[PDB]
């Protein structure tokens, strides 16, 4: 009656992918010094 919308403004979701190098501590595991 009112009209079913199909424009679908947000149907272009696209989406990418990213990451971040994290900080670590290997001092106690060191076999040496």
């Amino acid at each position: 009656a009112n009209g079913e919308d199909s424009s679908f403004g947000s149907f272009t979701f696209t989406v990418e992918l990213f990451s971040t190098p994290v900080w670590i501590w290997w001092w106690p595991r060191i076999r040496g010094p």
Binding site: V15, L17, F18, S19
Partner: protein, 109 residues
């Protein structure tokens, strides 16, 4: 005479739907409808929609007598996945696959 009804791009992973689809393969349509009615799964609703549509297609486009129809074939194929992002800790992002599926029911006698 075989009659086909499909639900393409159904919003559920194939595995979850196959769990239900295996439950009614080879059954009579009335018994299959009962089994689907009393199964507590989201996929049961989808599969029952498709099976009802297949019965209606048979009765209308083809011959008739719902009484002697059987679920001759049923299978679920993987549909295209939707890529999404779930942000994780420490600035990492993960890929989420929102899996879909194609549901096919073939009724016959």
């Amino acid at each position: 005479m075989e009659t086909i009804a499909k639900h393409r791009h159904a919003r559920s992973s194939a595995q979850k739907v196959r769990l239900v689809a295996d439950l009614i393969r080879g059954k009579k349509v009335s018994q299959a409808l009962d089994i689907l009615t009393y199964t507590n799964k989201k996929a049961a609703v989808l599969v029952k929609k498709v099976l009802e549509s297949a019965i209606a297609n048979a009765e209308h486009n083809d011959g008739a007598d719902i009484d002697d129809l059987k679920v001759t074939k049923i299978f679920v194929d993987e549909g295209p996945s939707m890529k999404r992002i779930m942000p994780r800790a420490k600035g990492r992002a993960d890929r989420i696959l929102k899996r879909t599926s194609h549901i096919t029911v073939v009724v016959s006698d």
